[PDB]
């Protein structure tokens, strides 16, 4: 078959398209109207953005396509260099780095992390908790405070204090305005205009703000000998079994760097958004807020009761199908081979996998696929091989998986069991786009059920 493409700008092509705060959900828009695969070209490359399970399971077969990099992980590259995000499947780095922090990424590995994931959430409620009357909650803003600090302390055991704060510290600054000038990067007619060499000043100065406190503490924990339950402990610590190295000093802060800029923004994205869901929808945050309670029996919780919260998982789940938090990932064809028996594609040319249109795909789902229903998730062998992707594919999925979903699962039921929560503004949904998606404005009212913590 012919491709289906949209509506083009000239010289410029489809380029212009991406000119937008909100490209994902334009992109979104696009494969409603177009279906589940459609060209987009810019000068000097093109695309394929795939939309159905059909296309997407066969784009998932690691035989035939591998990660690339799409644009704004290209400059992303320029600060967390060859960590485990920016790194093609086969530099020698991305190997290493994954099979030493592959079991400490590991379910069984949140048990070590547990401790200081609490002493943040802690902080978190015992915030709300100290709100006045009239006062509100700026929902993504805190739980952004609060999973910048949980990477921090169990990355590097280094404390953000988010909650202490106004103005960041000037490393998450720094990190914050140098993911936006990758961005940004994106969308100039002419990247060399002298109106620009402001932007690459502050971007070069935020690059050495991010290395030389990652460096420091580096060389302060070979310095010290201290033995910590972080990740920086057992990257010193650790060797690849197949090459038999350790990563070098850069890598590490390459990863330190890279577990900062990649997962804090993607989970402080679900929370705020599984409880955007909930305030919508009464009788799922109900049923929720009773499973808190009835499995959170403990003046903080275990690592055994945040895996028992099994409603509140289902939760998080759908909120991941409805607005998967980092979106869109690329792939390239290894080979000459023919997608989905219609679609020829040379050695190297890419595909785009939109995973908020895969999640909405009702061959798969049914028709309510804009309806939030935890339920769905309810008996996950019900769902098909490749129909749900919010943390990527194969060998390059997420391996900050099982530590966000606990993080997401331990704050959420600890807020679910101390507060009742009212949209008192009505909220409308406004999604933010970054690297990641969140609920822009997104504010709320708790109501203290005065549990003791
Ligand atoms: C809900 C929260 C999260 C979601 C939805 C999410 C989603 C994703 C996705 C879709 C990918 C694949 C990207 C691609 O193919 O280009 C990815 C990769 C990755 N994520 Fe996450 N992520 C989240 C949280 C985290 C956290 C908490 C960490 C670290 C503590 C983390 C670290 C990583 C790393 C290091 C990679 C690269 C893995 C590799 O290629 O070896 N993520 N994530
Ligand atoms: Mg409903």
Request: contains cysteine; hydrophobic residues 40%.
């Amino acid at each position: 078959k012919e491709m289906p493409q949209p509506k083009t700008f000239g010289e410029l092509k489809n380029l212009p398209l991406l000119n937008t705060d909100k490209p994902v959900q334009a992109l979104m828009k696009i494969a409603d109207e177009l279906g589940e695969i459609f060209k987009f070209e810019a000068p000097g490359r093109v695309t394929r953005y795939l939309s159905s399970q059909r296309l997407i399971k066969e784009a998932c077969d690691e035989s035939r396509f591998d990660k690339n990099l799409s644009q704004a992980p290209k400059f992303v590259r320029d600060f967390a260099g060859d960590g485990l995000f920016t790194s093609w499947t086969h530099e020698k780095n991305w190997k290493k780095a994954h099979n030493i922090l592959l079991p400490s990424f590991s379910q069984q590995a949140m048990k070590g992390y547990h401790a200081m994931m609490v002493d943040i959430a802690v902080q978190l409620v015992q915030k709300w908790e100290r709100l006045n009357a009239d006062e509100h909650i700026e929902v993504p803003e805190d739980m952004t405070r609060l999973t910048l600090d949980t990477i921090g302390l169990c990355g590097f055991n280094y404390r953000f204090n988010s909650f202490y704060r106004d103005q960041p510290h000037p490393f998450i600054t720094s990190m914050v305005r140098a993911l936006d000038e990758a961005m940004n990067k994106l969308r100039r007619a002419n990247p060399d205009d002298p109106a620009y060499d402001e932007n690459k000043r502050q971007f070069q100065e935020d690059i050495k703000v991010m290395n030389d406190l990652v460096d420091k503490i580096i060389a302060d924990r070979k310095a010290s000998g201290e033995q910590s339950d972080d990740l920086l402990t057992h990257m010193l610590n650790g060797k690849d079994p197949e090459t038999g190295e350790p990563l070098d000093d850069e890598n590490i802060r390459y990863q330190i760097i890279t577990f900062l800029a990649a997962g804090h923004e993607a989970t402080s994205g679900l929370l705020s958004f599984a409880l955007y869901f909930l305030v919508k929808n009464p009788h799922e945050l109900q049923k929720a807020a009773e499973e808190a309670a009835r499995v959170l029996v403990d003046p903080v919780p275990s690592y055994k009761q945040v895996k028992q919260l099994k409603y509140v998982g289902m939760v998080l789940n759908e909120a991941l199908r409805l607005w998967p938090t980092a979106p869109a990932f690329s792939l390239y064809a290894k080979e000459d081979t023919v997608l989905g028996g219609e679609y020829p594609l040379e050695k190297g040319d890419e595909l785009m996998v939109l995973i908020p249109q895969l999640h909405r795909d009702k061959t798969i789902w049914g028709d309510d696929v804009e309806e939030f229903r935890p339920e769905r998730f309810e008996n996950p062998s019900a769902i098909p091989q490749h129909a749900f992707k919010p943390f990527g594919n194969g060998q390059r999925a997420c391996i900050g998986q099982q530590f966000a979903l606990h993080e997401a699962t331990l704050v959420l039921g600890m807020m679910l069991k101390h507060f009742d929560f009212e949209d008192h503004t009505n909220y409308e949904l406004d999604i933010k786009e970054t690297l990641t998606l969140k609920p822009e404005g997104f504010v709320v009212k708790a109501k203290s059920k005065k549990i003791p913590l």
